[PDB]
């Protein structure tokens, strides 16, 4: 299957912006726990948020809990990220990951299988 990275963009900062992810293909949706991660120049790609399935439950990476808001839409096999305060900090390039299975802490890279190719979200003063 393939994941697709719709939102994105450049934003001010203390302004909003919402990424969303859809996976494409056929063989259920139900059973893929889904991973939102971020990179920016120079650091590494760390995790941002996630929200394993049979349930829904979300997970945030520290820097980022309060603002961004993970969920998912398992009739449009959706994964949608909302960032509320974005700030400098949030400025990376953003991917979309999944993989079948369950987890119950706020994932690593080594979790997911199919990723997205990313999206470009540029936060500025």
């Known amino acids: 299957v393939q994941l697709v990275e719709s939102g994105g963009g450049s934003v001010q900062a203390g302004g909003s912006l919402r990424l969303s992810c859809t996976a494409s293909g056929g063989s259920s949706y139900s059973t893929f726990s889904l991973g939102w991660f971020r990179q920016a120049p120079g650091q590494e790609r760390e995790a941002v948020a996630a929200?394993?399935?049979?349930?829904?439950?979300?997970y945030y990476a520290d820097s980022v809990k309060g603002r961004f808001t993970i969920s998912r839409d398992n009739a449009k096999n959706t994964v949608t990220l909302q960032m509320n305060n974005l700030k400098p900090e949030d400025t990376a390039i953003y991917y979309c990951?999944?993989?079948?299975?369950?987890?119950?802490?706020?994932?690593?890279?080594?979790?997911?299988?199919?990723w997205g190719q990313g999206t470009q979200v540029t936060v500025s003063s």
């Open positions: 929200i394993a399935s049979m349930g829904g439950l979300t």
């Open positions: 990951a999944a993989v079948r299975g369950y987890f119950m802490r706020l994932p690593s890279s080594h979790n997911f299988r199919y």
